[PDB]
Design a protein around this ligand. Structure first.
Ligand SMILES: COC(=O)[C@@H](NC(=O)c1nn(Cc2ccc(F)cc2)c2cc(OCCCCNC(=N)N)ccc12)C(C)(C)C
Lengths: 338, 218, 265, 57, 232
């Protein structure tokens, strides 16, 4: 009616900013005092993977910790054997402008998408001996930016038209939709048991969704600019986000607010990706000045650098058993560190 | 060798994937790639016919040279997230309508787009080809519709020669890296097939200055 | 033989003192780039063969001519052989740069496919192979133990390759002439001028060095030898230290990609 | 019309404000606890013998 | 997927024939191929191998200089030229397809066979049973023993199990070891270590009747074991 934007809606945001302050009695970086540091952490390039001809944009590990897939702007999708650095499959894509890839947990399927607005599914196990397309999922209106399997039949996608969506692979229809954001959604990450997931958008916020219902549960607001990457903590009760203002942050789901900020005065470039190591004591982030820093997560001291690359570090990932770390870059190489 | 019989036949499979990868990266380096931009009102659609959801490609061979043109205006997202995918095209083509000067908010809408792409940090080394379409409809509109409705400072003749010539310097002054980039202006006819003959001549100029700068001989 | 100056035999070390000193300094500050592209390989290899000539020549030469130290019939052929290798490993570096530059305008689109990391070792280290063959020749009155053929034969591997490089740098300066004016007509120069101001600086430096010396190695075959001409052959034989002092000025500098780079970093 | 949208942005803040929150000391103690029971089996902060890792060479 | 071979017939000692096989239903150029032979009333014997891309070829010492194997990809066909045939070459000949990468299953599809009747350092595999009678629903075991250990330093042991029913071609049951081929009931299983292996069937149906073979794939030449029949 009259003035209704004023009184009621801007009041409930003043009830939330005062309830988060009624539970923040102490800060993380005080109680994490008088514990041992982790000391310097040098690692070394164990493998190097050659064969792409253009920039590499995405990568994802298989669940056995030995195979992996990668995508690049030359229209190829390669599956690698990382112990003996052999190529297992090479897949040609219809279009060349690809921005994400994922591996099915069973190991039977892989997914792909980009500036064509489609998510393509590929069957790896056939009676004929080659890899053929199995499904195409249409309906988004902007470029696809991320996707993740839940099992052999379900998959979630985030899109540049400000929306996320849940799909059914038997048919080709999206069964649920997710709307609240007001900018382009850039990334998403699934809970360890796959009941919840989070996403971050260019409106500088992150959201917690429920999968079976389809409703937002919490919103988080700390950054000054866009959010590029996001990841869950192994416990399942915190997550970290990396933004375009050269900072990372830690959020707590049950305290409902922020715990730490990971920054430094000599670092003034954006962040492309982020990941946690097993047990969650280290936070790896890969930045836009060609490096990859390693942070102590409880304390806020940076505890290492790994500087083998020659151009922008676009993606990284840590394996399930915790053995190695991979990075892809805009010079077309992949490297395994340990 | 310490490898098994099956370990050796997996190495041989891999070296034959390696050979089809090289065969594909050589057959794709024989084509020039071009991004097509411009605040889209009229001209951009006819120049494709002149040469014959997400992203739109097109092919055409002319005189032993193969091209791929990319139209991108059908996206409607934040342009500052995906535009860096096009780092490393050979050139950019840019379309403008000369018949949008006194309709002057629109002519200054094009000068707003030409200023942001020409000064990106991703396109520091990329030259620009520039078009100016609809040179018929601009013939008489200078007569009935005088200028200074599009540019207040222009205090000179409405003779249609200083007019088109004055619109030109207003764009090329927008180039702020006079050393690492050139502009190539041309006035599109729409009946002659000289349109594709100009794109050929400018593109073979862009490549020789790249080679001569790769060996240090510049 | 011991033909030399009465007391000038160290004053020739006055000139030689400075020229040998810029060569050791410039080539290492040049070879610090390790901008590691297939074209910036041959530019470092040229910066090496000056040093290997820089040490093996300025000390060997100052064995003679000031305090004479003879040797046996094999201590000469393996001092001299090393010097010849040092001399013959520059033309293997200059000849391979006017190769990839030649195709850059001949096949303007074909520049980036042919030349990558694979080459610069297919025919590059093969060049050193020819020097090894020269050593093998030695294995099985200007210079003490030397025969006319070997001196004459070493002119065949050098006078010819220097004759090609004047073809490349006059091709590029012409075939880039017709381009820059045939387009100023169809487009309605500057490319045919910038190629002028650099290529005359390569042609003049390369005939004032390889020119006079190889002239005199022709006169001691047909002409009436004397010590009257052996003095000037000693003074102008130090042009080689000047040639290895101009090359980083003519190659490493004018490449503006590296030029600004060290100006900043 | 935008007047219909505003009464949705009020329907959502109602759901977010009534959550049950715990305080920051008790949530910061549980992230220390998890990083200790699992500190042994993480090869990236404790290098492993060359026998165990398969990426030696 | 099918493989159909032709040629064969009757030949005098010293003549020559030419055999072929027609592939249909799969990506022929991606698979390696084998020829395997079986004389009248005895077991299986490996003959020759050509890899995908024709870059590698191996032969058995019995037929080394007398036979030649080749392939024609755009036609999807496989050849075997024979010269100077002797009476030890009477047999039925099969055609087998196999692909090699991390996690694949070699030796999975077998042809129907063609008969040729001519007129009138190696690992040894020993399985010492024959004609063991059993009733349905019972538990039966089989074993064969190697003369060298098949466990390789990379972790794998290379032992396979095939089955041949009266009137048909062999089928695969277990690859490298304890791995079950697709389309096979779960009541089979394989176990062992080093140089002693075993195959177990839990409770039989009326169609698990025939002879059983074992094979090593640790190094060329490939060798089979003799057969272990099962009569009900
Ligand atoms: C080893 O002990 C020494 O020092 C003696 N050696 C020289 O006198 C000397 N030996 N060789 C090699 C050589 C000689 C005869 C051949 F038949 C083949 C090979 C030179 C080559 C030169 O140059 C040529 C062309 C100009 C090239 N210029 C550039 N590359 N910049 C000049 C001098 C010598 C000593 C003590 C001074 C006599």
């Amino acid at each position: 009616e009259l003035d209704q934007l004023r009184q009621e809606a801007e009041q409930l945001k003043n009830q939330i900013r005062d309830a988060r302050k009624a539970c923040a009695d102490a800060t993380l970086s005080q109680i994490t005092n008088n514990i041992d540091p982790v000391g310097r952490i040098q690692m070394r390039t164990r493998r190097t993977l050659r064969g792409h001809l253009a920039k590499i944009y995405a990568m994802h590990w298989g669940t056995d910790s030995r195979l992996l897939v990668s995508a690049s702007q030359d229209g190829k999708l390669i599956i690698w054997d990382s112990y003996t650095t052999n190529k297992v499959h090479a897949i040609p894509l219809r279009s060349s402008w690809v921005m994400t890839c994922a591996y099915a947990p069973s190991g039977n399927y892989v997914a792909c998408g980009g500036l064509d607005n489609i998510c393509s599914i590929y069957n790896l196990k056939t009676r004929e001996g080659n890899v053929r397309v199995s499904r195409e999922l249409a309906g988004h209106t902007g470029y696809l930016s991320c996707c993740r399997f839940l099992d052999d039949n379900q998959i979630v996608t985030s899109s540049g038209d400000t929306t996320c969506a849940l799909w059914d692979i038997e048919t080709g229809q999206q069964t649920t939709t997710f709307t609240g954001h007001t900018g382009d959604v850039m990334s998403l990450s699934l809970a360890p048991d796959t009941r919840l997931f989070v996403s971050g958008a260019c409106d500088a916020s992150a959201k917690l969704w429920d999968v079976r219902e389809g409703m937002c549960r919490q919103t988080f607001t700390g950054h000054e600019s866009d959010i590029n990457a996001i990841c869950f903590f192994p416990n399942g009760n915190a997550f970290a986000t990396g933004s375009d203002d050269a900072t990372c942050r830690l959020f707590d789901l049950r305290a409902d607010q922020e715990l730490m900020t990971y920054s430094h005065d000599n670092i003034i470039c954006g962040i492309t990706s982020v990941s946690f190591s097993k047990s969650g004591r280290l936070l790896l982030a890969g930045y836009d000045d060609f490096n990859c820093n390693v942070w102590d997560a409880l304390k806020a001291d940076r505890a290492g650098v790994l500087a083998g690359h020659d151009n922008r570090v676009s993606c990284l990932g840590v394996t399930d058993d915790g053995m190695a770390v991979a990075t892809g870059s805009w010079d077309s190489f992949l490297k395994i560190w340990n | 060798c310490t490898l098994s019989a099956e370990d050796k036949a997996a190495v041989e499979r891999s070296k034959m994937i390696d050979r089809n990868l090289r065969e594909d990266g050589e057959k794709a380096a024989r084509e020039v790639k071009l991004l097509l931009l411009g605040a889209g009102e009229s001209g951009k659609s006819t120049i494709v016919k002149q040469m014959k959801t997400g992203i739109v490609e097109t092919h055409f061979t002319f005189k032993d040279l193969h091209f791929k043109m990319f139209d991108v205006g059908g996206q409607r997202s934040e342009r500052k997230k995906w535009i860096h995918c096009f780092e490393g095209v050979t050139a950019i083509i840019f379309c403008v309508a000369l018949s949008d000067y006194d309709l002057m908010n629109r002519m200054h809408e094009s000068m707003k787009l030409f200023d942001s792409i020409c000064n990106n940090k991703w396109f520091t080394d990329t030259s620009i080809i520039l078009f100016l379409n609809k040179k018929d409809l601009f013939e008489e509109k200078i007569k009935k519709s005088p200028l200074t409705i599009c540019y207040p400072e222009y205090a000179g003749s409405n003779t249609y020669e200083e007019a088109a010539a004055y619109i030109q310097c207003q764009f090329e002054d927008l180039n702020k890296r006079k050393d690492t980039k050139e502009i190539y202006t041309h006035f599109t006819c729409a009946t002659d097939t000289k349109n594709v003959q100009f794109v050929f001549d400018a593109v073979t100029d862009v490549i020789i200055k790249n080679n001569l700068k790769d060996c240090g001989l510049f | 033989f011991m033909v030399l100056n009465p007391s000038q035999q160290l004053a020739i070390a006055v000139l030689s003192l400075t020229l040998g000193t810029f060569t050791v300094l410039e080539n290492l500050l040049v070879l610090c780039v390790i901008r590691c592209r297939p074209s910036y390989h041959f530019i470092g290899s040229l910066a090496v063969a000056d040093l290997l000539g820089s040490v093996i020549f300025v000390y060997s030469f100052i064995d003679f001519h000031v305090f004479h130290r003879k040797d046996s019939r094999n201590v000469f052929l393996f001092k001299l052989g090393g010097v010849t290798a040092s001399f013959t490993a520059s033309v293997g570096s200059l000849f391979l740069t006017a190769i990839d530059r030649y195709i850059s305008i001949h096949r303007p689109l074909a520049y980036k496919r042919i030349v990558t990391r694979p080459k610069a070792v297919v025919a590059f280290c093969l060049m050193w192979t020819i020097a090894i063959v020269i050593a093998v020749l030695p294995l099985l009155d200007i210079f003490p133990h030397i025969d006319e053929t070997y001196l004459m034969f070493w002119i065949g591997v050098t006078s010819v390759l220097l004759l090609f490089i004047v073809y490349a740098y006059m091709y590029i300066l012409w075939k880039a002439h017709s381009h820059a004016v045939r387009m100023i007509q169809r487009g309605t120069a500057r490319m045919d001028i910038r190629l002028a101001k650099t290529l005359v600086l390569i042609l003049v430096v390369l005939i004032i060095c390889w020119g006079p010396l190889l002239a005199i190695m022709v006169y001691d075959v047909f002409g009436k030898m004397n010590k009257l001409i052996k003095t000037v052959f000693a003074f102008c034989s130090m042009l080689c230290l000047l040639n290895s002092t101009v090359n980083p000025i003519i190659y490493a500098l004018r490449s503006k990609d590296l030029r600004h780079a060290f100006r900043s970093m | 019309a935008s007047i219909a949208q505003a009464r949705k942005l009020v329907e959502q803040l109602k759901m977010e404000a009534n959550i049950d929150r715990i305080k920051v000391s008790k949530a910061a103690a549980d992230l220390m606890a998890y990083c200790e029971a699992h500190a042994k089996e993480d090869p990236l902060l404790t290098p492993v013998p060359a026998s165990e890792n398969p990426f030696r060479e | 997927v099918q493989l159909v071979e032709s040629g064969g017939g009757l030949v005098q000692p010293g003549g020559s024939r030419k055999l072929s096989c027609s592939a249909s239903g799969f990506a022929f150029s991606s698979f390696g191929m084998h020829w395997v032979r079986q004389a009248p009333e005895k077991g299986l014997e490996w003959v020759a191998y050509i890899s995908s891309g024709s870059g590698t070829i191996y032969y058995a010492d019995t037929v080394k200089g007398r036979f030649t194997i080749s392939r024609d990809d755009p036609k999807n066909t496989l050849f075997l030229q024979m010269t100077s045939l002797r009476s030890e070459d009477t047999a039925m000949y099969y055609c087998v397809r196999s692909i090699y990468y991390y996690g694949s299953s070699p030796f999975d599809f077998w042809g129907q066979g063609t008969t040729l009747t001519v007129s009138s350092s190696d690992i040894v595999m020993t399985q010492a049973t024959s004609s063991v009678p059993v009733t349905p629903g019972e538990s039966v075991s089989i074993s064969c023993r190697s003369s060298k250990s098949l466990l390789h330093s990379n972790g794998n042991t290379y032992l396979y199990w095939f089955l041949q029913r009266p009137g048909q071609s062999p089928q695969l049951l277990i690859y490298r070891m304890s791995n079950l081929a697709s389309g096979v009931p779960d009541r089979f299983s394989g176990s062992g270590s080093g140089t002693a292996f075993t195959l177990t069937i839990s409770r039989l149906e009326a169609e698990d009747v025939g002879v059983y073979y074992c094979m090593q794939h640790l190094e060329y030449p490939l060798t089979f074991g003799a057969g272990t029949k099962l009569e009900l």
